[PDB]
Amino acid sequence: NLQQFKNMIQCAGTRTWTAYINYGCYCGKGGSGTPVDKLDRCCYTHDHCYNQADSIPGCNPNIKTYSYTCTQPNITCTRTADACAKFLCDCDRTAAICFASAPYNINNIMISASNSCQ
Amino acid sequence: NLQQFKNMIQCAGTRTWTAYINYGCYCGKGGSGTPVDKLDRCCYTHDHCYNQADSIPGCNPNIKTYSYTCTQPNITCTRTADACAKFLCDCDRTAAICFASAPYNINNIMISASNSCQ
Amino acid sequence: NLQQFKNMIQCAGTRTWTAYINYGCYCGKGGSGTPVDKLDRCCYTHDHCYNQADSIPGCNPNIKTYSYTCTQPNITCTRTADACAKFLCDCDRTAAICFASAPYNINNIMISASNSCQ
């Protein structure tokens, strides 16, 4: 669930989800070219993870509500039996954590239409 | 199995399992508050891993014996078919390795009853 | 399969597959003793991964063709339904990445018959 992903982002990081709305070539809806940096790389992975989520029966990355807990700054995906829930929570936990450890290059905000994402 | 987690600890790390019995808010039985450091986080994760293991048919974190090998300092989980054995060996390997890479803040030994695990 | 692992290496790293053909105690066929360094550990792990892959029905590490994409330097395993394909692509992607982040100690090329791999 996207609303759970948004909360996981501020759980694990200092920056919120809005910070990543327009970053690099892959953070946001869509992606072209090669990821410009580690952060963009994070979004690249998460992006493929969601894509893959569809391959799971009754699994929609945006709809699916899973189980998780946040112990600022720790995220725990508690689902075991529900494979779709488990898979999806992992994608998001991965991204949130990746987003936090990665540096934020403001130099790479709004480069989408540049020769950077060709 | 717990005796296996113990050996994994000294396999991958320098410090033995006794070193962690009294660390931070989550190393050892129970756990409350925010983990104080990376090591305590390691214990926090491992702790939730065991809890998640119960959700596996015929799976008890303490008595379940799996297959693993130690080529000090390397740990290899051999189980593939046995989902419980596999899951558990992984929990432990994750922790044993995490413990090894994590710094040991002696300042964080015996703080469980302090305002830090509040 | 092996041709896909070879290409994954060039994808994720600077050095190609031939670079590791003769490295440490585990890179290349066989392997005995303690991995001498980070990179060697990589091969050690990957090697155990291929071994474990045989425990999957209709799964041969060298023959199995999986689905993956490379966006230098990024690798994505796209398999979800095909457990064997998925497992194997992971082994390789893991190795390719481990190989790229690990330092290359030319001092550890051709030491297989020395006292170091005992």
From Swiss-Prot, chains A, B, C:
Expressed by the venom gland. GO terms for biological process: arachidonate secretion; lipid catabolic process; phospholipid metabolic process. Binds 1 Ca(2+) ion. One of its GO terms (molecular function) is calcium-dependent phospholipase A2 activity. The active site is at residues 46, 92. Ca(2+) binds at residues 26, 28, 30, 47. It catalyses: a 1,2-diacyl-sn-glycero-3-phosphocholine + H2O = a 1-acyl-sn-glycero-3-phosphocholine + a fatty acid + H(+). It is an enzyme of class 3 (hydrolase). Keywords: Blood coagulation cascade inhibiting toxin, Calcium, Disulfide bond, Hemostasis impairing toxin, Hydrolase, Lipid degradation, Lipid metabolism, Metal-binding, Neurotoxin, Presynaptic neurotoxin, Secreted, Signal, Toxin. Disulfide bonds join 11-70, 27-43, 42-98, 49-91, 59-84, 77-89. Its EC number is 3.1.1.4. One of its GO terms (cellular component) is extracellular region. Its cofactor is Ca(2+). It is found in: Secreted. Snake venom phospholipase A2 (PLA2) that shows anticoagulant and neurotoxic activities. PLA2 catalyzes the calcium-dependent hydrolysis of the 2-acyl groups in 3-sn-phosphoglycerides. Belongs to the phospholipase A2 family. Group I subfamily. D49 sub-subfamily. Monomer. This is Basic phospholipase A2 KPA2. It comes from Bungarus caeruleus.
